[PDB]
């Protein structure tokens, strides 16, 4: 078949869009007349000398902005800002219309956006710089739709989603072929958790432009993850990596996470689990040979090293991530959770409970941190406190499928005795969730259910005891057999009772 | 081990929130959208020559609904004769 790569959509496009759009050499006419100069961006192009030459020759603003874009690709954000400023100082822009000055103001706006993005810090200062540049551009030329796109992006960064959505509605009124408007709308919808609504926009953008940056396939894979079709997500991410093999390590990280999830939830045997887990570790390490300080990779490796009893290195990585990415609360929550898990072996119940609470406060979506908090409450013999916390969490999250939480609730209520009905409900929910997940149902839940049903239904209790015995197999104990025999004796099953007693 | 099983169930669900770095959109990222002032319009009109057919078959497979039938005509107004 036809190879799926960047060259595929290169050949799909006409040769005008193939070579010219990716030229690393810029042709600049000279002020002397027909003389021109060609400077290759592969070589080390100096910003100051190039700007001085451009000002002397008074070249078209397109060349200035193209050089700025290339220096952006080089990462020279300061150099691109210098290019923009000296272009504003150039005679061409001063003698041109206000439209060119507005376009360069919007370019400086994009420069501020990239400076904020590349650092994820000083957000207010760069946002104010970008806002001032965008306001100047709009005042100089308000008819440019790029000013509206910049306004919408500014609203999105300040979480003014309604105004950005209105701006994208206006852009859709102007034209429905605007790819950037589609991307911004889909980003806002994903931020608003409208995964499917953003997914239609992702598909439309991908169909319109398969070579558009940012990659729509990243959002499509996120939606497939939200729609459980993670296999298609991985396939689309592989296609994106083929199209974008550079500066897209996040796709490889997502692929590694998907492989780890598949290994956890699909390995049919221990040997297959080991093979898949080691392959995922090798792929993660190969990605780490490019970047060795990525906080998410360290957090992921912390799980493996905690499973390897390397708690000291887990603490080192957690502290390093906390120092680097304290802005991200999710990393703080994960580090606190792992510190509490490490201290659990040390049984620092007060310290582990405090760490679990801090993890919950950092990121409330971390259910595991709350479950560890409840477990630590149990460790400190806080039966009532753990019960109250668990009831609060369940009543706030009645739709959450925390099977172990429901099992613990059932056990606590069985110990209480008076709340047997909630215990039955929670144990049945745990049984159903385990059956849906194809996970081994704990026979202890069956024993608790039989104990509860002793005073309600001997038939259901006996059936649950039989199910627990079938799960145990050779693990049947003396108490289970004695209770089965007593059940059959009460059922007048003399033969079965005698066999169970034997 | 109960918390380990809970982690395995959860895996890295809530850790994908930071991975949204691909959602950010910047104009300068595209190489050829800026080389001319109207390169945006040219590239928006460069893909009008392309369609779903020109998409790669594997990328077409990525277009999954979240075939024509012979008995559903498209309406007309002048007919023929």
């Amino acid at each position: 078949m036809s190879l799926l790569d960047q060259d595929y959509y290169l050949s799909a496009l006409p040769e005008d869009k193939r070579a010219e759009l990716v030229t690393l050499q810029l042709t600049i006419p000279l002020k002397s007349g027909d003389e021109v100069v060609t400077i290759d961006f592969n070589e080390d192009v100096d910003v100051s000398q190039l700007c001085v030459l451009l000002e002397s020759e008074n070249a078209r603003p397109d060349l200035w902005l193209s050089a700025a874009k290339v220096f952006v690709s080089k990462g020279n954000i300061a150099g691109s800002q210098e290019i923009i400023r000296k272009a504003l100082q150039s005679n061409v822009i001063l003698d041109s219309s206000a439209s060119v000055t507005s376009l360069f103001h919007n370019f400086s706006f994009w420069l501020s956006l990239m400076e904020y993005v590349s650092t994820n810090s000083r957000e207010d200062q760069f946002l104010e710089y970008a806002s001032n540049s965008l306001q100047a551009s709009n005042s100089l030329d308000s008819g440019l739709i790029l000013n509206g796109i910049g306004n919408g992006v500014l609203y999105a960064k300040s979480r003014r989603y309604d105004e950005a959505l209105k701006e994208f509605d206006n852009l859709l009124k102007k034209k429905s072929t605007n790819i950037l408007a589609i991307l911004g709308k889909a980003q806002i919808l994903y931020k608003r958790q409208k995964y499917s609504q953003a997914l239609e926009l992702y598909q439309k953008a991908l169909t319109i432009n398969p070579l558009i940056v940012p990659d729509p396939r990243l959002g499509i894979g996120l939606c497939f993850w939200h729609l459980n079709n993670k296999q298609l997500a991985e396939q689309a991410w592989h296609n994106s990596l083929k199209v974008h093999p550079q500066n897209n390590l996040n796709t490889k990280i997502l692929i590694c996470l998907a492989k780890f999830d598949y290994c956890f939830n699909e390995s049919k045997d221990d040997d297959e689990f080991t093979a898949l887990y080691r392959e995922s570790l090798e792929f993660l390490h190969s990605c780490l040979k490019e970047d060795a300080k990525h906080p998410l990779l360290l957090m992921v490796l912390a799980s493996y090293y905690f499973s390897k009893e390397d708690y000291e290195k887990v603490e080192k990585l957690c502290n390093l991530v906390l120092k680097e990415n304290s802005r991200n609360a999710a990393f703080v929550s994960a580090s606190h959770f792992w510190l509490a898990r490490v201290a659990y072996h040390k049984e620092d119940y007060v310290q582990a409970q405090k760490q679990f609470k801090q993890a919950e406060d950092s990121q409330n979506s971390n259910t595991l941190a709350k479950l560890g908090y409840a477990q630590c409450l149990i460790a400190r013999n806080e039966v009532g406190d753990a019960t109250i916390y668990l009831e609060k969490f369940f009543k706030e999250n009645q739709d959450s499928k925390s099977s172990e939480m429901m099992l613990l609730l059932g056990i606590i209520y069985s110990q209480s005795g008076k709340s047997y009905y909630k215990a039955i409900i929670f144990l049945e929910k745990y049984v159903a969730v385990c059956q849906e997940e194809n996970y081994p149902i704990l026979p202890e839940a069956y024993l608790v259910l039989s104990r509860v049903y002793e005073n309600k239904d001997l038939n259901v209790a006996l059936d649950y005891l039989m199910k627990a015995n079938d799960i145990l197999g050779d693990k049947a104990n003396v108490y289970v057999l004695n209770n089965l025999g007593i059940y059959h004796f009460f059922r007048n099953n003399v033969s079965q009772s005698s066999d169970f007693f034997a | 081990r109960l918390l380990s099983a809970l982690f395995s169930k959860d895996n890295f669900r809530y850790l994908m929130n930071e991975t949204s770095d691909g959602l950010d959109v910047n104009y300068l990222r595209i190489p050829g959208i800026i080389e001319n002032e109207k390169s945006l319009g040219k590239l928006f009109s460069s893909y009008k020559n392309l369609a779903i057919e020109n998409l790669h078959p594997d990328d077409r497979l990525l277009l999954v609904d979240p075939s024509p039938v012979f008995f559903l005509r498209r309406p007309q107004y002048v007919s023929d004769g």
Binding site: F264, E266, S267, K268, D269, D270, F273, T274, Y277, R278, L281, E282, H285, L288, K289, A292, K293, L301, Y304, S307, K308, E309, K313, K316, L317, L320, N438, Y439, P440 | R1, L2, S4, A5, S8
Partner: peptide
């Protein structure tokens, strides 16, 4: 039988021991 075959140590809770049985050397900075 794949429904019963998949039930093994990691599902039973011996996942940590399995990871301990998998040894790998990283180029750790810390």
């Amino acid at each position: 039988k794949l429904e019963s075959m998949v039930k093994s140590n990691y599902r039973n809770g011996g996942l940590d021991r399995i990871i301990s049985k998998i040894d790998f050397d990283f180029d750790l900075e810390l």
